Amino acid sequence: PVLVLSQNTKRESGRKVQSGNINAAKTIADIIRTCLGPKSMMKMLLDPMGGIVMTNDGNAILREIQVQHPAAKSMIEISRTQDEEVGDGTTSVIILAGEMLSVAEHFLEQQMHPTVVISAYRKALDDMISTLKKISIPVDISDS
Amino acid sequence: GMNKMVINHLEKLFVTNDAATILRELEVQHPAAKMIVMASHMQEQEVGDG
Amino acid sequence: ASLSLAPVNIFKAGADEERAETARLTSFIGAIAIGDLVKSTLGPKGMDKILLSSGRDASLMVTNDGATILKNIGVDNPAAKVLVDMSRVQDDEVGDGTTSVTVLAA
Amino acid sequence: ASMGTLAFDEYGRPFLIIKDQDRKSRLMGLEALKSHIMAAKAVANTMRTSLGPNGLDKMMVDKDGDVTVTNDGATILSMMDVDHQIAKLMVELSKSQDDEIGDGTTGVVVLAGALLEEAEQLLDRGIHPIRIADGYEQAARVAIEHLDKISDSVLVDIKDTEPLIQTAKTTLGSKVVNSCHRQMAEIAVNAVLTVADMERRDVDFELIKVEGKVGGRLEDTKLIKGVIVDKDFSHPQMPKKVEDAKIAILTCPFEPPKPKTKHKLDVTSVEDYKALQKYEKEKFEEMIQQIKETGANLAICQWGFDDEANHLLLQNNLPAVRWVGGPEIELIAIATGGRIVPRFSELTAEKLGFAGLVQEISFGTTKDKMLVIEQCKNSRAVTIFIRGGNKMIIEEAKRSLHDALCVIRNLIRDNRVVYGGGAAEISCALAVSQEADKCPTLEQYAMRAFADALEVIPMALSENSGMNPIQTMTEVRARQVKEMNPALGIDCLHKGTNDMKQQHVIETLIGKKQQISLATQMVRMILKIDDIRKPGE
Amino acid sequence: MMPTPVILLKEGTDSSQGIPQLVSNISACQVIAEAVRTTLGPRGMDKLIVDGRGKATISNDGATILKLLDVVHPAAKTLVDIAKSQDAEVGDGTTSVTLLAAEFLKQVKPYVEEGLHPQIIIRAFRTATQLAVNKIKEIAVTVKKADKVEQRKLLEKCAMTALSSKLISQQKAFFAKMVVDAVMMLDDLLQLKMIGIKKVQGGALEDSQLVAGVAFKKTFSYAGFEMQPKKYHNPKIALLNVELELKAEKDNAEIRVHTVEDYQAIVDAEWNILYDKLEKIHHSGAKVVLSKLPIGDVATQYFADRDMFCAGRVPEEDLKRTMMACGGSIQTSVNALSADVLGRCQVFEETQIGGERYNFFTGCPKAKTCTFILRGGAEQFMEETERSLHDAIMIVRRAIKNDSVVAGGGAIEMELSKYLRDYSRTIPGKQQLLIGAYAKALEIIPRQLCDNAGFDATNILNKLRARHAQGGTWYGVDINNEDIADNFEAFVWEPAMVRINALTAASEAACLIVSVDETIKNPR
Amino acid sequence: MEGPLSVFGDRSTGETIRSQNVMAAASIANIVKSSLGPVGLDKMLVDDIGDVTITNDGATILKLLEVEHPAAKVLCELADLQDKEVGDGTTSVVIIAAELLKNADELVKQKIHPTSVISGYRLACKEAVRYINENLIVNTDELGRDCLINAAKTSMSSKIIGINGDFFANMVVDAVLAIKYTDIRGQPRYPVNSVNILKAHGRSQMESMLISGYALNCVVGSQGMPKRIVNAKIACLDFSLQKTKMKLGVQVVITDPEKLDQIRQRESDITKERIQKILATGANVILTTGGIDDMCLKYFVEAGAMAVRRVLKRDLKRIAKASGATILSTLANLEGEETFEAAMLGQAEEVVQERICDDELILIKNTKARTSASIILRGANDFMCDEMERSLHDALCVVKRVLESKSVVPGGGAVEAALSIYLENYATSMGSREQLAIAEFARSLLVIPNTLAVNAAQDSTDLVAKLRAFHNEAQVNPERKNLKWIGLDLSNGKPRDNKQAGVFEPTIVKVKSLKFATEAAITILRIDDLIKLHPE
Ligand SMILES: Nc1ncnc2c1ncn2[C@@H]1O[C@H](COP(=O)(O)OP(=O)(O)O)[C@@H](O)[C@H]1O
Ligand SMILES: Nc1ncnc2c1ncn2[C@@H]1O[C@H](COP(=O)(O)OP(=O)(O)O)[C@@H](O)[C@H]1O
Ligand SMILES: Nc1ncnc2c1ncn2[C@@H]1O[C@H](COP(=O)(O)OP(=O)(O)O)[C@@H](O)[C@H]1O
Ligand SMILES: Nc1ncnc2c1ncn2[C@@H]1O[C@H](COP(=O)(O)OP(=O)(O)O)[C@@H](O)[C@H]1O
Ligand SMILES: [Mg+2]
């Protein structure tokens, strides 16, 4: 056998990879979609050490579940990032990322280039930041 | 439209861009897709194109 | 070079080709084995052999006849087969001499 | 060797083109040519030791352990369990020589192997294998014309058979039956001349029955001008000898007649039963009475008969043979001059054959009997009865005598004769060398190689005879060129003289031409191959 | 690329899609071409393939080689198919077609990798193919004289060219004369079943021969056949489909008698049935008797006593050829054996041919059939001889039907490459590149000729490209001189339909392979 | 084996092995072709354990891959060498080497001798280098600092810091100018790999920070120590501050119990005295490559100093060079005593422990005696942060090359089109077979703009034809030589003056790419046989 790459090296490419990544992300989102808001319901997770985790926390859930798709891995990692940075919004972030990828799937199917989509996303992010800072209000932290 | 070369379980080769033929020679196993294929084959039977 | 000792073997799996000295060696050894077997039956003071077949019937013969002895043995050497057939043809032509012709050939 | 396809893709996706391509092999180009040449050289060097009077035999063992000792190249290569396809081609080449000629089956193989061995060096020097094949074709044409030029002619008449006997002795010199050299040559010649159509120039070998029986000595082999059958008289009290035998040849079993169509004879009364009984009795009596009234003293049936017929023959003094095979019935008819009769009603005194002696022959302490029919008037059929001390020498005697008969046939077909002992090969090599000298193109090398290959037969004869190959061959070549005498060859038998015309060493011109042509054509077909594909295991 | 609880297709479906799949198809076609490249031209070589049973086939014929290769690639099967189609429609050019198709694919491979639309590529291919075909039809030399000597010269030259690639090239004049006599002695239909090809192991190529008549091997004679004579000097010939032997008068027939007199009558009646058939055959004057059905020993001996010749179980094709040669009809009944239904030849003989016995019917002047008898030192030798002769025969047939000749050695390919380069330099610039690639692809025939011969294809193609642009259209590769030459004067002639169909088939295969954009293998 | 040659292995020979080598090289190049240019896309790589790597760097991809074929390992090592010697072009060099191999094997199939192909490639490489150096370079002096910014933005296009290039290029340029230093021989040196790059998932990319000073991936050793110091006097030590243990060849053997107490206390008082000597000079921040026992950390705590342990040797060397300190492996002078001079101290306008998302690090700000630079990259996860690190390293190397050699060339296939034209015209003069080899070299060079357009999803044929038309007009009409600067605009699918658009690459990138690609093609093309021995 005269191979160029080692056997077990499988290479996927193209719109199959793009749609697969987007589906993995939106699946990670669908996992915890119902754990958002005041009327959420608990989930009982079973650790490999015979333990139990009864929670509503997006990062807790995604940290207790295990995946093999690298897109899902990346989504769990960004949930961890959100939790470590601010300590809240760990499932709002997941849902927003899933929805953004979902809506980008449209333009990707419609021959738009991912770099074009990305430039649009970055413009929109800057303008989101501007709008948030404009609509924000101050706080007197001395008011217990 | 580009042609496809479908090889069925009997190792027979079909080179075509005829949708109903491609569907026939594929082994569609999901039931909803099977239903869409049933619709396509009924269209082929009734009209012959489309 | 040679049919057997060539970079390519020209034969089906299981065949073989003994060349000059190897062939003469196997031939002489087979013939002389047959002859040494069939002698000691030669002459008035010759002694008999027990054939003792190995089939499921396990036939048992006590013979002094060289033709009978050679007919009733499992021979695999071609030269030995030649001598066996020679003794059989002697036994067909005349009824005696089947041990002397074999001993002489050997 | 190398595999069919070794990419699997420039993109990582499966690349499957041929079925079981991973288990399949392939050899391409000059390495393929050299593999072919190596295989052919192996076969040829196996065969070259069985060439000439001092040539030795080979002991072939089949799948079931039966032994065959032989010097016949075609029989050897047929018994040889070869796997290489080029060796299979060489077996086919030898078989073709045997079909067309019946002699030369070892010369063809040796010569083809030599041609390929020389092509090996020519390919090393970089010549195109097709150019080699074309130079070989050119040199082969030159050698064929030189054979036609140096050929001699012999008389194929039935009065003086000494030239034919010399030819047959040359053919049989290399076989185990050279202990009875002249007896075997005489009987091969007399056989073909008795059964040979001189006007048509055809010789039907179905009319020559070559029978062998263990016992006796090789010297006991004789020519029967007639037929021998492996049967005896039907009744044990019949006489064992019949002189001045008028023979009735019949293919009707001496039994009550029987329709071929599905039939049911219905018995419906005691009178019907008695009529049937009397019909059967009278049928038997009528058959025997018809055979007797024909005047015959002997009957020969093809389909056997029953107790009533046997005893009626005995009572009526009609010795009879039964269960004789179709071919032997035909031979008996042809030999005795009789006509084969399908039923007794059609039998007449003119359809009978005549043999001056019909005898039953014993073979010592065996209980087996044979029937000889001979002393016919002008038998156009004949039998060769071979005796010997073992079935191995009997079978070798059979095939050697077949070679001799085929050689006499080739003489009857074309009386032209070249002299052997490698003399013809040396002369053709000289002619090819001269033509290569006169050739200015690149085929000069191929023609010189063809000459050096033609010279392997005298070298092989010398080697098998213990002489020094190069010395002997160069001296006889020098003598041929100096004193123009293409009858100078190898003194294999050490008679002193190198003159094959004086030693009566004789070959057939069509035989030598067929050798050269077949060797050249097969070498061309082998050199034209540059790619082998074979299935795994 | 994500798991689903229920998958759309059956587990194991392998789908290759896109530019990689297309490039891989082109590569597989390149492999298939490589498998036959070295057989092209007078310096071409033979291939030895072996089956699972261990039986080897040795061939120069590209169609044969590709049939024997167990090709399974869906795109590479197309080259095998077009080689089959070429062998069908023409009978020669099978290697050229595959080489041309694969070279078209190789030439367009770069643009395929750079994203050129396959529809554009196939449009360019169709355009260039139509142009080249019309140019062949325009510049093909068709002598409008209908002279018989010139038409035999033409057929002999086309056959010599078609044979100057095989293992019988050293006898191609001989075999070409024989092939030409054969197809010129055939009837209007030029049926291939009307040319017999017997293969008798043993003998030389020059010992092979053509029989202006019919010949077939002796067929299982019974006793008395040697008592029969074996040469007749003006025989009348009875061709029959009749079993002549004692047999059940019918398989569903049952005789019922209740008397021994009736029993004996029935026995004698069977015998009289047979003897009456034989007596009718004997009284028809026929001295030779051939039956598609068995002829028993009784009938054999009857004919031997009447000094007649009989042969049974003769094969149907040999019987039909004997009929077309001698001029009779095959009879299932022997009740009307008139001279109109009997056949006739000037000589009938049974001779020995290399270990076998053969019956020869010679001297038939009204013969619309001939039989080749091929000699050689091996089964595969004779098989490749037969294949070469089949190539030559098909060529001669097509030439007889349309004597419009072009020159070979790559002359026509170089002329068309020049013409297509010229045409491409006059179009916008997208189709320009693709038609120029077509043109460069056409050069694969002289290039491969020089390769197989051992020359510098680069220098020779430079010489040819130069000489074809200076004026001159039949200049191609000269093999024996390692140079170029006017191949129309050197008599390297090729029927125009050969190259027309080669271009058509190669372009169609290329267009198909390039139109395929996805491959879906279902699990077995 | 089956052949007469008894070697215990397989043997490929001739067109078989040549086609195999080309197939391998093409495979490797087709892996990376999709990651070339501003429209290229990134790749995931999974390491059989779930370890994920996002990347656009061709060298990184080919290092992570597990290659089995030697002709493909050659190209992998080629990409590695390009990354070592240049820092950019790691994909283009592989693509060009593979295309040179393809065309050269096509010529060898047409039976041009490989020696002749190799001579032609060597000639074409030399003449392409010369033509670039003579006609296609732009002086960064004539262009100013926006030249550096444009080179950085050009390098960052095709990376995940592309559109943010407007700001990342400013950061990169500021950092390289900060770490600029001149040595003996008065040559300006820009020692990248001295810019520290830290990664910390969290705030957006735009929130990445340029530190005027140095950033240390370390923390204080004790929570009782301060975590901010303003007038930082810095002591860099290459030895450990622990309870002193006698060395291997020294043993304590007591025969008078009254000495044991003093010996045991001395074992700690030695290090105590060393620490007091260090602290007496004013050192309030102490970085150490070794460890610091708790006993010592308590001394630092009581002194109000900031001690840091297990610092890395390279980080310490950089902090020392940047702050003016002297790394001490020992407190030992030329007088056989133990002292610490205030001249061995360094200075910094502040040293603080700053809180990054969920970790903590130390920032040394405004060091004197030299300026230093660190960059804290901030993204959405470790994958993003690692790819940002690799992209930023590429950009830093690019700016370094632009500042060392003051020549740039335009991008977007401008150089490749110009070289294709010039070399297809130049081949006409050199031999007859080397001519074909040089023409094929020229045609091969076009694989870069072809790939750029293919990835941009544009008509590669039309675009490269327009490019070649422009550059031929430039090389045949002396009045339009300004057309040399035309290349691809992959956002619009139209040629464009890339010198005015700001698509610049360091000349060294293209030159070294060409030289290395030619060397790789020559070495692989020289192979006409292969003997693969069966392992033992
Ligand atoms: N009474 C005897 N005295 C001397 N020699 C004898 C006597 N009887 C037999 N022989 C010798 O013994 C041999 C016979 O031995 P036997 O066992 O019959 O051998 P084979 O089977 O070959 O005939 C003969 O050669 C004969 O000369
Ligand atoms: N008595 C002889 N003296 C010299 N040469 C002989 C003699 N008999 C045969 N030869 C040569 O031996 C060669 C080999 O023939 P042989 O091997 O006997 O038959 P085949 O070649 O058919 O097996 C022949 O070419 C012949 O010329
Ligand atoms: N004598 C010759 N000289 C030069 N070229 C020839 C000669 N004979 C045939 N050719 C060329 O060889 C090419 C292929 O020959 P051949 O192998 O017979 O074709 P195929 O294998 O396709 O049937 C033809 O295109 C023809 O032009
Ligand atoms: N803005 C741009 N417009 C056109 N081409 C560009 C631009 N930026 C980079 N390129 C081209 O991209 C090619 C390499 O891109 P990239 O993959 O980022 O570099 P590397 O070769 O180091 O992998 C260069 O040849 C360059 O000409
Ligand atoms: Mg919350």
Ligand SMILES: [Mg+2]
């Ligand atoms: Mg439609």
Ligand SMILES: [Mg+2]
């Ligand atoms: Mg002989």
Ligand SMILES: [Mg+2]
């Ligand atoms: Mg042909």
Ligand SMILES: [Mg+2]
């Ligand atoms: Mg880059």
